[PDB]
């Protein structure tokens, strides 16, 4: 299952991106949860999307 989208700060400001041809962006983070049904284990990890 998936849960909780959440962003970070941008990696570079606007004018530096226009200078060095980088794209203005920010990373996505997602709390993922893997559930086994028979024994039963949940696993919470912060997947960089």
């Amino acid at each position: 299952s998936f849960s909780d989208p959440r962003f970070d700060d941008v990696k570079a400001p606007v004018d530096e991106c226009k200078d060095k041809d980088m794209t203005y962006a920010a990373p996505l983070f997602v709390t993922a949860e893997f559930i086994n049904n028979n024994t039963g284990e949940i696993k919470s990890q912060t997947v960089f999307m």
Binding site: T39, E41, I42
Partner: protein
């Protein structure tokens, strides 16, 4: 069997801590879950204490298992299947068994192989992952500075 803050070993997630005993009910029964977060993967694991032994969470080893794997790692004359695919499947199963003696046997065999030859990217990742989780289990079984535990494992390997 367990309290809060105890160090424990999983099948293969390295050693870990229990952070709390979760009382999350399910189907209207307050099953005694336990949050158990690990070191390497930076993830938590919730397991009910009923099937804790069914999934096979294992308490840390002591001095008897310590010198047992110190004699297992020092034990010579281990033969190997010359079919490398059977070898890879075999020690992959032995690594996934979660047994400390089997993990020590795997890392000492693969150390004796790549010490002479230098094996593979896959076998090198195999040795790296298994040696890492065995070093973590050693540095939480004796609590003696995992870098220094790595050096003392290098000491008893060539000895």
């Amino acid at each position: 069997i367990f309290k809060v803050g105890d160090t424990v070993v999983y099948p293969h997630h390295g050693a870990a801590l229990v952070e709390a005993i979760e009382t999350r009910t399910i189907k209207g029964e307050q099953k005694e879950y336990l949050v158990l977060k690990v070191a390497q993967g930076d993830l938590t694991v919730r397991v009910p204490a009923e099937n804790a032994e069914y999934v096979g969470v294992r308490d840390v080893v002591g001095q008897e298992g310590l010198d047992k794997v110190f004699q297992v790692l020092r034990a010579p004359h281990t033969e190997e299947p010359t079919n490398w695919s059977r070898r890879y499947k075999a020690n992959l199963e032995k690594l996934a068994s979660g047994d400390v003696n089997k993990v020590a046997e795997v890392v000492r065999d693969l150390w004796r192989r790549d010490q002479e030859r230098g094996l593979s990217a896959g076998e090198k990742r195999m040795l790296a992952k298994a040696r890492q989780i065995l070093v973590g289990e050693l540095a939480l079984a004796e609590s003696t500075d995992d870098a220094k535990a790595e050096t003392i494992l290098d000491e008893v390997l060539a000895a």
